[PDB]
Amino acid sequence: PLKVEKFATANRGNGLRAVTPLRPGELLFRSDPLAYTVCKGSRGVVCDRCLLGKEKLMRCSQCRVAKYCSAKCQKKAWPDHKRECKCLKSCKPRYPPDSVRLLGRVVFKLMDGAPSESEKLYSFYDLESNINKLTEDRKEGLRQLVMTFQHFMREEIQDASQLPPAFDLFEAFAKVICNSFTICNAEMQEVGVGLYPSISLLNHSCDPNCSIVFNGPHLLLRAVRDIEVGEELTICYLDMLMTSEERRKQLRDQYCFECDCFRCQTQDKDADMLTGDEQVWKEVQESLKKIEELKAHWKWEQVLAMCQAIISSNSERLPDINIYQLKVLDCAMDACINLGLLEEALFYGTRTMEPYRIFFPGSHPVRGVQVMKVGKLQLHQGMFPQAMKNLRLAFDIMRVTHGREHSLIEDLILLLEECDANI
C-alpha cells in the first residue's frame, strides 16, 4: 500500500501528501523514468543507459551518437533507442537540445511502450504546463523548440497520426520546462535529464520535508523530516547554494510561481552567503559560468586551473562561507579527486565542511556525499579517527537521504568497516 497520495492543494495545483505518519529516511516512492537521456556535457562520457562513466565507451554503429558502457547496456537500450537512432543519424552533425531528445523518447514511449509504472500516480498528460503564465518571450522560445522537434524527428514522425491523440507539441514542451528532473550520478555530478510524472506531483519548498536521490536513472523519494497524516510532501527544486533573489528568478522563469515560504520572506542566510567584498565575488560568480561549463564536460584539468587561480589568487580573496567561493572550492575538490590529486582534494574538501553544515541543514543528500568524499580522502591518507568521524556522519545523513535501496550506502558501509578495522 502507498504511503503517499495525490490531492488538490488550495493554491499550488495538485500535490502529494502523506497517508501515514512518516519518519526521517522512510522510502515513499521509487521510479524509473518515463523517458530520459544523457545531458549535453556527459554525452559520450557516461553510458546512455545506466549513466555510469567509463574510460572507453562503445558507440551505436548506426547513429554513432548513443554510447554505452557494455554490450549488455547497448542491447538493453535498443528498444528505447531504435526510433531516435534514425533521427540522430539523418540529422548529423546537428545534435538536438536535450529537451528535444527527451521529448522524442517521451513520444516513442507513449506510442510504442506499455503503460509506464512511472505514470502510476500522475501521467505526462496530467502534467502542469503553466501555459497561461508564460511570457511572450518564453512562448517564442517554446515555438522554436517545437520546430526543432519537427526538424529532428522528421524521419520517424511525419504527421499527427504518429503522435498520441490530441498531443500538442507546444503544450508538451511547456510541461517539460517545469517538470524535467536533472539526474545526477552517485558523486552528484549532473549526467542526465528525465521525466518522472508521478514524482512531478511534488511541489517546491525552500525548506523541504522530503528528498530525492538518483541511482543511475532510478529515483528514490525519501522523507527527511517527521511528517504527519495529510501533510503535504515537498522537495527543493533548487541548488541550496542560492540567495533568495536567485531562487525568485529561477522559480519565476522555469516554474512560474512566487515563493511565500519563511526563508524567502526573511532572505534567510542571504547575508552570510554574500560575505566578502562584492567586487570580488561578482568576478568569481562570473568565472563560475565557465568553470561549471567545463565541469559539465568533465574537463577536470581546466576546471582545477581556473579554481586555483581564484582559491590561491594574488588578488583579494573570499571567505569560504561565500557561496561562489564555496562553489569554486567544491569544483576544485571534485577535479582533484578525478585527477588523483588527493592531498589537494582533501584540503579543499575539508574547507567546505563547515559551510556545508550551515547551508545544507538537516539531512541533505548533497552534504552526505560531500562528507563521505572527505572521510574517504582521510581514510586513504591514514587519518583513521578523523575519517571514522566523517564516515559516521555521512552514514547518519545518507541512511536518511539514500537508504539501503541506494548502492552508495553499500560502498559507505565498506569504508566504515575498513576504517574501523584499522582503528
Ligand X SMILES: C[S@@+](CC[C@H](N)C(=O)[O-])C[C@H]1O[C@@H](n2cnc3c(N)ncnc32)[C@H](O)[C@@H]1O
Residues that bind ligand X (CB under 6 A): 12-15, 127-128, 130, 178-179, 200-201, 203-204, 255-257, 259
Question: Which among 261, 226, 263, 322 is positioned nearest to 22, based on CA atoms?
Answer: 226
Q: Toward ligand X, which CB reaches closer, 256 or 419?
A: 256
Block residue for cell numbers 498520441: 164
Given Zn ion, ligand X, none, residue 73, with its beta carbon under 5 to 8 Å by kind, binds: Zn ion
Residue 143: CB atoms within 10 Å: 13
**Residue list 257-276, contact with Zn ion (CB under 5 A):** 259, 261, 263-264
Q: Least distance to ligand X from the beta carbon of 9, Å?
A: 7
Per the rule left: phi > 0, alpha: psi between -120 and 50, beta: everything else, 299 is beta
Q: Toward ligand X, which CB reaches closer, 106 or 335?
A: 106
d(CA 86, CA 152): 10
d(CA 14, CA 5): 10
Measuring CA to CA, how many Å separate 369 from each of 38, 53, 301, 324?
Answer: 22, 18, 22, 20
Given Zn ion, ligand X, none, residue 60, with its beta carbon under 5 to 8 Å by kind, binds: Zn ion
Given Zn ion, ligand X, none, residue 50, with its beta carbon under 5 to 8 Å by kind, binds: Zn ion
Whether the CB-CB separation of 325 and 284 falls below 8 Å is answered with: yes
Examine residue 251 and tell whether it contacts Zn ion (CB under 5 A): no
Q: Toward ligand X, which CB reaches closer, 177 or 335?
A: 177
The x, y and z cell numbers of residue 350, run together, are 575539508
**What does the DSSP assignment read for 148-184?**
HHHHHTTTT--SGGGSPTT--HHHHHHHHHTT-EEEE
Examine residue 77 and tell whether it contacts Zn ion (CB under 5 A): no
Q: Least distance to Zn ion from the beta carbon of 248, Å?
A: 8
Given Zn ion, ligand X, none, residue 372, with its beta carbon under 5 to 8 Å by kind, binds: none
**Residue list 343-362, contact with Zn ion (CB under 5 A):** none
| Span of 64-72, 175-183, 281-289, 326-334 interacting with Zn ion by CB under 5 A | 64-72
Q: Toward ligand X, which CB reaches closer, 15 or 44?
A: 15
* Residues 37-56, mask of contacts with Zn ion (x by CB under 5 A): ----------x-xx------
Block residue for cell numbers 515513499: 28
Examine residue 60 and tell whether it contacts Zn ion (CB under 5 A): yes
DSSP 323: H
Q: Toward Zn ion, which CB reaches closer, 67 or 327?
A: 67
Q: Toward ligand X, which CB reaches closer, 259 or 332?
A: 259
Given ligand X, Zn ion, none, residue 200, with its beta carbon under 5 to 8 Å by kind, binds: ligand X
Among 63, 77, 163, 341, binds Zn ion (CB under 5 A): 63
Among 16, 85, 220, 227, binds Zn ion (CB under 5 A): 85
Q: Least distance to ligand X from the beta carbon of 3, Å?
A: 18
Name the residue type at position 239. D
d(CA 193, CA 103): 11
Question: Which among 9, 12, 17 is positioned nearest to 223, based on CA atoms?
Answer: 17
**Residue list 171-230, contact with Zn ion (CB under 5 A):** 206
Q: Least distance to ligand X from the beta carbon of 14, Å?
A: 4
Residues 6+ apart with CB under 8 A from 349: 333, 370, 373, 374, 377
| Span of 73-81, 95-103, 183-191, 393-401 interacting with Zn ion by CB under 5 A | 73-81
What does residue 192 show for φ and ψ, rounded to 5 degrees?
A: -165, -175
Examine residue 16 and tell whether it contacts Zn ion (CB under 5 A): no
Question: Which among 238, 315, 321 is positioned nearest to 276, based on CA atoms?
Answer: 321
Please give the residue ranges that form the binding site for Zn ion (CB under 5 A): 47, 49-50, 60, 62-63, 66, 69, 73, 85, 206, 259, 261, 263-264
